[PDB]
Design a protein around this ligand. Structure first.
Ligand SMILES: CCCCCCCCCCCCCCCCCC(=O)OC[C@H](COP(=O)([O-])OCC(O)COP(=O)([O-])OC[C@@H](COC(=O)CCCCCCCCCCCCCCCCC)OC(=O)CCCCCCCCCCCCCCCCC)OC(=O)CCCCCCCCCCCCCCCCC
Ligand SMILES: CCCCCCCCCCCCCCCCCC(=O)OC[C@H](COP(=O)([O-])OCC(O)COP(=O)([O-])OC[C@@H](COC(=O)CCCCCCCCCCCCCCCCC)OC(=O)CCCCCCCCCCCCCCCCC)OC(=O)CCCCCCCCCCCCCCCCC
Ligand code: HEA
Ligand code: HEA
Ligand SMILES: CCCCC/C=C/C/C=C/C/C=C/C/C=C\CCCC(=O)O[C@H](COC(=O)CCCCCCCCCCCCCCCCC)COP(=O)(O)OCCN
Ligand SMILES: CCCCCC/C=C\CCCCCCCCCC(=O)O[C@H](COC(=O)CCCCCCCCCCCCCCC)COP(=O)(O)OC[C@@H](O)CO
Ligand SMILES: CCCCCCCCCCO[C@@H]1O[C@H](CO)[C@@H](O[C@H]2O[C@H](CO)[C@@H](O)[C@H](O)[C@H]2O)[C@H](O)[C@H]1O
Ligand SMILES: CCCCCCCCCCO[C@@H]1O[C@H](CO)[C@@H](O[C@H]2O[C@H](CO)[C@@H](O)[C@H](O)[C@H]2O)[C@H](O)[C@H]1O
Ligand SMILES: CCCCCCCCCCO[C@@H]1O[C@H](CO)[C@@H](O[C@H]2O[C@H](CO)[C@@H](O)[C@H](O)[C@H]2O)[C@H](O)[C@H]1O
Ligand SMILES: CCCCCCCCCCO[C@@H]1O[C@H](CO)[C@@H](O[C@H]2O[C@H](CO)[C@@H](O)[C@H](O)[C@H]2O)[C@H](O)[C@H]1O
Ligand SMILES: C[C@H](CCC(=O)O)[C@H]1CC[C@H]2[C@@H]3[C@H](O)C[C@@H]4C[C@H](O)CC[C@]4(C)[C@H]3C[C@H](O)[C@]12C
Ligand SMILES: C[C@H](CCC(=O)O)[C@H]1CC[C@H]2[C@@H]3[C@H](O)C[C@@H]4C[C@H](O)CC[C@]4(C)[C@H]3C[C@H](O)[C@]12C
Ligand SMILES: CCCCCCCCCCCCCCCCCCCC
Ligand code: CUA
Ligand SMILES: [Ca+2]
Ligand SMILES: [Cu+2]
Ligand SMILES: [Mg+2]
Ligand SMILES: [Zn+2]
Lengths: 227, 56, 513, 102, 44, 72, 143, 49, 40, 70, 44
């Protein structure tokens, strides 16, 4: 989850999120440098009493200021598209889990073997247990095995929603009549939080996602206990 | 039929200061007043309808 | 005489004045809505106790700022006042149709404020996506009133586009080629072409939404074989062109302002500026699905939209560097208008660069539907459009009115607004990177510090807006009449005096070959 | 080349029947360039001021030389040094000698 | 029609105090409207 | 006018060619050739070709064009 | 010299450092003494007094370069006034906090935050750089 | 002849700066705004279970 | 730009009145609504 | 007597000098940013995972009582 | 030509200049374009 006064991304939970952090670092250096250079050049143009107000020839300089940006865009696009096609590559999941968005809660279906399904609602503020997080906790967490490739399938039974977990690099819209696929792999155990990410009405702010990542043997026993 | 365009050219070029939408004569004034009365009356009715629809 | 002049106008200047008054009033509405947003977000917990009302406020904020403030001011106001004067034309091509483009806007606005007053409002976002905007999740008249608002705004701008394209093509002096028209006139022509092509697609899509809500069609309803994603494609096919429509006249005004206050006869690289605006207009039609990177589209489609989107930076950079090259060697006059334009160049550049971050679909997965997007467009659109409007307004106020502003007050106004908008929007980058969703009435406690600072910034900009009203009053209260204006040889709109007579160019300009 | 530029401008101001419009056009055009004019150009412009019976324009020309140097404080005193024989021959007082630098 | 400064506008600038009232009502009504819309929605 | 068509040539048409050239040159690497299967609807031989040994197509590429009996 | 609205279409006088020789003289109308001074200007400028040379300058031009290019104290007014209005803004925020904002949620209570902090460290929130990375699990203290 | 800025600029700058700092410091520190800063180096974690 | 002196000069006192009335026109109605939110 | 100073191309000269200065600074910033942000991040993740024991991390979380499932 | 005693001239000083130079031409002595010096004379 996010922490107070946070400036950047949540720490990466998945290898793809790690990749996104290094790509963001590369891109932001470029944004910083260009922003700075424009501000600097503004200040340079504005700090002399020397003048030159006759017609100035443009063609030589326009070569520089098309070619250099084209090269910079290629240096962004190359690693950008490498990550795009890395996520898309065939991975062989161990487990498929469905999530269905509703106004205003998530349901989860684990139907590889048994018909396991349940609803996941925000814990009201007045019912939080000491130490628990306002607007983020749910009654029934999405328990998943750590260090395993999981296929998540996302849809809705009413309006649009969007299933997001920032620390895993995940955001997939939940569209009725459509079954959208994404892959989830956690490098670590723990609790990973997200929030509905398509405006779905009055309680859009209040239908969070909590993943609980545990060893396979714990997941298997939890699965059995939830039938 | 006969070509009466010259007679309409004379009427619509008469130096009487009338704007083109009234230059045909008394019938233009009536059709203008009908149009503007329905527009302004209908607009007041539309505001009444909003007032009504703004409450349960 | 008053009704004949102000309700029955066929005069480009008076219609322009009507648009500026309308847009200024709309900006107060849109500003009040923005302050309600930030008052809710300024402390964790609930203020309004009704998140449907929060969603209505956000939706109305966007529609008012886009359709009733920026487009009427830039195109209706500056376009009507300046375009005929800059080409020596005696009016617009269709001077009576021009008046109907204006008078469609008060009714459009009335339908939007009816949408908010009936039932529970349209709490949809300005995108109005189904099924949230459909007849189950938004039962009753609110969304239909919003759709009709957009229909009347659309007709207004389509007929206005026809008017400006025809005027600009057909009503220049016979010796004047397209390559001897001022950059502002180019900016309006290109904006008008984008309006002509994009708004009919929006009209088709919101019409489909209307029939799904009222005539039992199923364009967007999977139960009938429809698809909510089809609505998104039609909306954004309009919506990306729309964001370039909102900035292009601003680019035109910035070119004139930077040229003027640099003491130059001409912008640097005229033909490059023309090329850049036409390239931006063209590319603006082939990038829309960067608004849809999370909907489930194919990897190759994501790769295409990422790449095509990034291409826009090349012509845009040519414009930024050409503005800097216009300053280069200038006898710089530090007028309030110049300050607005310099603020524009910097803040636009920041927002454009966060756009290039978003263009990368891999990073957009994590940034989509977060405050990072809100930060991006309040830099490029919100601050870019507003800074260009304020620069144009203070530059041309003495032309339109015949009176001068107090330059010291106008510089005070600029300074407060620059502080306020940066304090408001810069921290929203941090909120977005750290995962705060947009369109939220309340937030996890971690996000409190940046939301608190952002809301405090929104109050600084309110102080700037109140001072702007006072500054306009003081100008009309004091009645300092214009005597002389520099650089009329390369700024034709000034050459008929301040204000120009009701009829200008009754005898056209003489231009030989 | 620099010599050809300077020669064209000397020829411009040296035209015996140069009119007031041409004097102004020349000086207003010249100060648009990225240079402080060479003393030989300023000399020719000052002598055109003399043929046009225009003392004030001669003083204004010296002011604009100083202005075109911007922060390069060494240029104006150098140009005045080079012009001293012309200033003495034509009785042109510097802006400094007239107190117009205050 | 009247031409010149203060004459090419649909409002009078003959009296700066009447103008202040008119501007107050004009901008003030636009800025107030959303607060009164929120109040209306809350009172249903 | 000529000026407008030159502006389209250098400002739209040739930049398009430059971008498609960049696109092509990014995907120019050799694809792994598919296993040979002697399908009867392919590698048709009803009459020897009037060149070489009669069994090679006119722009035969040994790397990607198998003969009826397979890759050379 | 009185500049008039109805002269807008005629060349006008300007003081601009980039336009040193404006289209008209500052003073077009001459008194008897000023006429005699313009006659004297047709003779050797060596015979003009300093005062006569200044009077000729001031007929042709309004301000000198030094006068038209002078610095001003305007920046103090602009910066000070902007700080005043930004200060005024904080009064509005004090009013909003006092009269509009009610209590914030109980999750901001010091004891809640101490517990939530420990729970975040127990689930190793941001353990690589962001949060738990700043906690020393061996010494039970912030690093 | 001295203008507005020559007569009043020093006082406008000094008074505006003094007032701005005073009111923002008071607003930030004295009226119960919850800034929710980082607990790092500030909060002693406490048992929650 | 050059301009005439003001035809109807607005004194510092008059500016303080205009600025005060302008600010109150924005602040009082919104203030009234926000003060009464609990009541609504 | 004063020496003849450079009188031509002073604005052009100033631009050239400061554009080169800006490039040189841009290169120094990229080096600093490589070290202070991008490399620091690569090393933080590499160092975290080098001897990372996911089961030990899970056991610590389980014993702290964080999980519904364990 | 003019039907009055002044008319606006725009001067395209060189073929293909994008910048047009605008000025009022008054009845009486020929005036010159302030950019290229081209002479214009009003014929009312
Ligand atoms: C008018 C004025 C109005 C005021 C405006 C509002 C004030 C906001 C205050 C911010 C102060 C932040 C703070 O507490 O800094 C402590 C912070 C402590 O260091 P840290 O916690 O180790 O942060 C380093 C991160 O790990 C570094 O890695 P990370 O991933 O954690 O960081 C990513 C993060 C990090 O970004 C930053 O560090 C922010 C850069 C600030 C810009 C100046 O954010 C961004 O990507 C920001 C998006 C920016 C978009 C484009 C910006 C264009 C810049 C314009 C250039 C002109 C310059 C003049 O120090 C800073 O980094 C200072 C900044
Ligand atoms: C959702 C709705 C959307 C609303 C959008 C609002 C934006 C509207 C834009 C257009 C403005 C209206 C103009 C068309 C006609 C207005 C009708 C009218 O009565 O006007 C009186 C009024 C001026 O009163 P005045 O000083 O007594 O009249 C002087 C005449 O010269 C002397 O003429 P006279 O002696 O023949 O007699 C004049 C007399 C008699 O006039 C007549 O015979 C005409 C009567 C029929 C007019 C019907 C059209 C209504 C206007 C359309 C919008 C609705 O008029 C009156 O004073 C009494 C009637 C007052 C009716 C009030 C309507 C005014 C606008 C409403 C504002 C918004 C309120 C919405 C509330 C929302 C609450 C939730 O005109 C205005 O509305 C102007 C606005 C007030 C002053 C603002 C100044 C701001 C300065 C900012 C500068 C930006 C421009 C920069 C360049 C400037 C240099 C070029
Ligand atoms: C031009 C477009 C524009 C402008 C100007 C603004 C201006 C502002 N906007 Fe925004 N805003 C949007 C377009 C705009 N906005 C859009 C499209 C959305 C998305 C809606 C959705 O999600 O569906 C949005 C959403 C949005 C949000 C996100 C809400 C959420 O996700 O829950 C926030 C949050 O702080 C915000 C704040 C503001 C603030 C504080 C201002 C201002 O207060 C900043 C200061 C600017 C001014 C005060 C304007 C001054 C101008 C005038 C008064 C005109 C004067 C006229 C003349 C001189 C002629 N706006
Ligand atoms: C004025 C309006 C405006 C303008 C001009 C832009 C310009 C750009 N926008 Fe933005 N955009 C919005 C208004 C605007 N946008 C709005 C309102 C939304 C949200 C809608 C909603 O959801 O409600 C949005 C959303 C939006 C998204 C969707 C994000 C999401 O929802 O997840 C993306 C994705 O690519 C995008 C990208 C860009 C890009 C690449 C540009 C480019 O055109 C920017 C180009 C400019 C520069 C790059 C800076 C100057 C260039 C240089 C100095 C040269 C050197 C630079 C480089 C080499 C990089 N914007
Ligand atoms: C590079 C772009 C264009 C290149 C043009 C072609 C170059 C060589 C020949 C030129 C003439 C072409 C015209 C069309 C005729 C038939 C085939 C041409 C197409 C071609 O070149 O096809 C080649 C085969 O050519 C073959 O068989 C053999 C081709 C040679 C013999 C053709 C003889 C037939 C002539 C027909 C005459 C009819 C004329 C019509 C008159 C009508 C008037 C009413 C393809 O190579 P491949 O190895 O099979 O596959 C590639 C594997 N890597
Ligand atoms: C659900 C309900 C929503 C619908 C709301 C409908 C909106 C508005 C009501 C429409 C009222 C129309 C009244 C007739 C308008 C005729 C306009 C016209 O014919 O305008 C002409 C110009 O446009 C031209 O030609 C070419 C343009 C002719 C345009 C004709 C009118 C179009 C109306 C709708 C257009 C939307 C387009 C549909 C696709 C998106 C004439 O221009 P003027 O300035 O008048 O004169 C110029 C003089 O020199 C002539 O002697
Ligand atoms: C990114 C902002 C940097 C601005 C770069 C501006 C580049 C301007 C150079 C072109 O101007 C030239 O300057 C030369 C004299 O020095 C002239 O001799 C030449 O005729 C002229 O064309
Ligand atoms: C030139 C000025 C402009 C003219 C303005 C016209 C104003 C007069 C409108 C009359 O009002 C009507 O009254 C009926 C009530 O008696 C309504 O009937 C409707 O509402 C009824 C409610 O009883 C329902 O039975 C039916 O839907 C239906 O008959 C109808 O909707 C409504 O319009
Ligand atoms: C957070 C964003 C903050 C925005 C800050 C706003 C700063 C306010 C600037 C006003 O101060 C004045 O600025 C003039 C220009 O407006 C200066 O002109 C002087 O200096 C200039 C040199 O560039 C010359 O052009 C002028 O002739 C000369 O009088 C003048 O001395 C100075 O007092
Ligand atoms: C985002 C835009 C708004 C920003 C904040 C505006 C700043 C506030 C301006 C003052 O507003 C007023 O505040 C008073 C309180 O100070 C209110 O009086 C209320 O409180 C008084 C004191 O209890 C009573 O006497 C009154 O009857 C009662 O209405 C009054 O109604 C209201 O107009
Ligand atoms: C040919 C055309 C118009 C020239 C004229 O008639 O004045 C000019 C105007 C803008 C020019 C373009 C812009 O300067 C941007 C690019 C600059 C590059 O150095 C060449 C390609 C580039 C895309 C240019 C090609 C061409 O020279 C353009 C398109
Ligand atoms: C007799 C009359 C002459 C009209 C005239 O020149 O004034 C003719 C000329 C063309 C005729 C029209 C055309 O022949 C076409 C139509 C033919 C139908 O049989 C009758 C109606 C019809 C629409 C005709 C009506 C009328 O008889 C018209 C108008
Ligand atoms: C007036 C026509 C000029 C055409 C110039 C073309 C250069 C820009 C190319 C991109 C967009 C062109 C769309 C037409
Ligand atoms: Cu569900 Cu937003
Ligand atoms: Ca709140
Ligand atoms: Cu877009
Ligand atoms: Mg979305
Ligand atoms: Zn010319």
């Amino acid at each position: 989850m996010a922490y107070p006064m946070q400036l950047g991304f949540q720490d990466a939970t998945s290898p793809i999120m790690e990749e996104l952090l290094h790509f963001h670092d590369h891109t932001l250096m470029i944004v910083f440098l260009i922003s700075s250079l424009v501000l600097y050049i503004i200040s340079l143009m504005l700090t002399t009493k020397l003048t030159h107000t006759s017609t100035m020839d443009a063609q030589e300089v326009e070569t520089i200021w098309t070619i250099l940006p084209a090269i910079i865009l290629i240096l962004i696009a190359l690693p950008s598209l490498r990550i795009l096609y890395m996520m898309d590559e065939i991975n062989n999941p161990s487990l498929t889990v469905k999530t269905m968005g509703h106004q205003w809660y998530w349901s989860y279906e684990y139907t590889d073997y048994e018909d396991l399904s349940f609803d996941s609602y925000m814990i009201p503020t007045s019912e939080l247990k000491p130490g628990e997080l306002r607007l983020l906790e749910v009654d029934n967490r999405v328990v998943l095995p750590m260090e395993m490739t999981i296929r998540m399938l996302v849809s809705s039974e009413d309006v649009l929603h969007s299933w997001a977990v920032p620390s895993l690099g995940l955001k997939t819209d939940a569209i009725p009549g459509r079954l959208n696929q994404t892959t989830l792999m956690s490098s670590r155990p723990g609790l990973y939080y997200g929030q509905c990410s398509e405006i779905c009405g009055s309680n859009h702010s209040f239908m969070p996602i909590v993943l609980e990542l545990v060893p396979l043997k714990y997941f298997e026993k939890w699965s059995a206990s939830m039938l | 039929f006969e070509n009466r365009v010259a007679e309409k050219q004379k009427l619509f070029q008469e130096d009487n200061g009338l704007p083109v939408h009234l230059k045909g004569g008394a019938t233009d004034n009536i059709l203008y007043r009908v149009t503007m009365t329905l527009c302004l009356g209908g607009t007041l009715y539309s505001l009444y309808c909003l007032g009504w629809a703004s409450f349960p | 005489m008053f009704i004949n002049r102000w309700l029955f106008s066929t005069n480009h200047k008076d219609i322009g004045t009507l648009y500026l008054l309308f847009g200024a009033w709309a900006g107060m509405v849109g500003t009040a809505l923005s302050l309600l947003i930030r008052a809710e977000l300024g402390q964790p917990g609930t203020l309004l106790g009704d998140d449907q009302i929060y969603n209505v406020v956000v939706t109305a904020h966007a529609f008012v700022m886009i359709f009733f403030m920026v487009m009427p001011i830039m195109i209706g106001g500056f376009g009507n006042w300046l375009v005929p004067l800059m080409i020596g034309a005696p009016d617009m091509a269709f001077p009576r149709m021009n008046n109907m483009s204006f008078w469609l806007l008060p009714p459009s606005f009335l339908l939007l404020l009816a949408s908010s007053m009936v039932e529970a409002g349209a709490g949809t976002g300005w995108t109005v996506y189904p099924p949230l905007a459909g007849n189950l999740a938004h039962a009753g008249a609110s969304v239909d009133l919003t759709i009709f608002s957009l229909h009347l705004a659309g007709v207004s701008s389509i007929l206005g586009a026809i008017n400006f394209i025809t005027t600009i093509i057909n009503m220049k002096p016979p010796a004047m080629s397209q390559y001897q028209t001022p950059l502002f006139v180019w900016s309006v022509m290109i904006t008008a072409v984008l309006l002509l092509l994009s708004l009919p697609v929006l009209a088709a899509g919101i019409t489909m939404l209307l029939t799904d809500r009222n005539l039992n069609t199923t364009f967007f309803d999977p139960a009938g074989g429809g698809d909510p994603i089809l609505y998104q494609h039609l909306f954004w096919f309009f919506g990306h062109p729309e964001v370039y429509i909102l900035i292009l006249p601003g680019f035109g005004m910035i070119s004139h302002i930077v040229t003027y206050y640099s003491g130059k006869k001409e912008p640097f690289g005229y033909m490059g500026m023309v090329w850049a605006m036409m390239s931006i207009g063209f590319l603006g039609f082939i990038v829309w699905a960067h608004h849809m990177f999370t909907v489930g589209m194919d990897v190759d489609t994501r790769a295409y939209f990422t790449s095509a989107t990034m291409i826009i930076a090349i012509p845009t950079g040519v414009k930024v560097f050409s503005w800097l090259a216009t300053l280069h060697g200038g006898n710089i006059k530090w007028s309030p208008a110049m300050m607005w334009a310099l603020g524009f160049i910097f803040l636009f550049t920041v927002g454009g660069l966060t756009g290039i971050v978003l263009a990368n679909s891999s990073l957009d997965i994590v940034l989509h539907d977060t405050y990072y997007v809100v930060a991006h467009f309040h830099y490029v659109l919100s601050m870019g459009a507003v800074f260009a409007i304020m620069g144009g307004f203070v530059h041309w106020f003495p032309l339109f009115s015949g009176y001068t502003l107090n330059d010291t007050w106008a510089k005070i106004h600029f300074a407060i607004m620059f502080v306020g908008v940066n304090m408001t929007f810069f921290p929203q980058h941090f909120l977005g990177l750290s995962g705060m969703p947009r369109r939220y009435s309340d937030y996890p406690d971690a996000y409190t510090m940046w939301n608190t600072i952002s809301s405090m910034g929104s109050f600084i900009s309110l102080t700037a807006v109140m001072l702007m009203v006072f500054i306009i009053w003081e100008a009309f209260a004091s009645k300092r009449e214009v005597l002389t204006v520099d650089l009329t040889t390369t700024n034709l709109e000034w050459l008929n005096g301040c204000p120009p007579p009701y009829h200008t160019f009754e005898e056209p300009t003489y231009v030989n070959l | 080349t620099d010599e050809e530029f300077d020669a064209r401008w000397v020829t411009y101001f040296n035209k015996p029947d140069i009119d007031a419009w041409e004097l102004r056009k020349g000086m207003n055009t010249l100060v648009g360039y990225d240079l402080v004019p060479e003393p030989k150009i300023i000399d020719a412009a000052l002598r055109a001021c003399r043929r046009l019976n225009d003392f004030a324009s001669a003083v204004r020309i010296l002011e604009v030389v100083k202005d075109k140097a911007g922060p390069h404080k060494e240029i104006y005193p150098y140009v005045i040094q080079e012009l001293r024989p012309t200033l003495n021959e034509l009785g042109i007082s510097t802006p400094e000698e007239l107190g117009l630098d205050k | 029609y009247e031409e010149g400064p203060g004459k090419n506008i649909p409002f009078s600038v003959e009296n700066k105090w009447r103008l202040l009232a008119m501007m107050t009502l004009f901008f003030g009504s636009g800025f107030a409207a959303p607060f009164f819309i929120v109040r209306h929605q809350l009172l249903k | 006018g000529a000026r407008t068509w030159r502006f389209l040539t250098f400002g739209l048409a040739l930049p398009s060619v430059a971008l498609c050239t960049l696109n092509s040159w990014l995907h120019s690497g050799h694809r792994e050739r598919p296993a040979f299967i002697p399908y009867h609807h392919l590698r048709i031989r009803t009459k020897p070709f009037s060149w070489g040994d009669g069994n090679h197509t006119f722009f035969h590429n040994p790397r990607v064009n198998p003969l009826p009996t397979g890759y050379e | 010299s009185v500049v008039k609205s109805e002269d807008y279409a005629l060349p006008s006088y300007v003081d601009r450092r980039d336009y040193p020789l404006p289209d008209v003289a500052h003073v077009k109308n001459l008194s008897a003494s000023q006429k005699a001074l313009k006659e004297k200007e047709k003779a050797s400028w060596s015979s003009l007094s300093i005062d006569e040379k200044v009077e000729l300058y001031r007929l042709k031009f309004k301000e000198s370069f030094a006068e038209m290019n002078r610095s001003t104290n305007e920046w103090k007014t602009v910066v000070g006034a902007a700080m005043f209005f930004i200060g005024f803004t904080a009064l509005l925020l004090i009013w909003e906090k006092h009269y509009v904002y009610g209590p914030i949620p109980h999750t901001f209570e010091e004891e809640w935050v101490a517990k939530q902090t420990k729970r975040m460290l127990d689930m190793k929130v941001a353990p690589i750089q962001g949060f738990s990375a700043k906690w020393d699990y061996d010494k039970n203290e912030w690093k | 002849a001295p203008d507005f800025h020559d007569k009043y600029g020093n006082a406008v700058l000094a008074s505006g700066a003094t007032f701005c700092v005073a009111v923002w410091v008071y607003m930030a520190t004295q009226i119960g705004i919850e800034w929710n800063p980082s607990p790092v180096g500030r909060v002693t974690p406490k048992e929650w279970r | 730009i050059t301009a005439k002196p003001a035809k109807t000069p607005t004194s510092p006192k008059e500016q303080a009145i205009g600025l005060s009335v302008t600010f109150l026109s924005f602040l009082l109605p919104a203030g009234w609504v926000l003060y009464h939110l609990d009541n609504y | 007597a004063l020496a003849k100073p450079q009188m031509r191309g002073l604005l052009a000269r100033r631009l050239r000098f400061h554009i080169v200065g800006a490039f040189m600074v841009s290169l120094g910033f990229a080096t600093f940013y490589k070290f202070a942000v991008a490399e620091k991040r690569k090393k933080a993740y590499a160092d975290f995972y080098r001897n990372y024991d996911s089961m030990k991390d899970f056991e610590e979380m389980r014993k702290a009582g964080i999980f519904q499932s364990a | 030509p003019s039907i009055t005693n002044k008319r606006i001239v725009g001067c395209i000083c060189e073929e293909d200049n994008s910048t047009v130079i605008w000025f009022w031409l008054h009845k009486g002595e020929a005036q010159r374009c302030p950019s290229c010096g081209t002479h214009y004379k009003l014929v009312p």
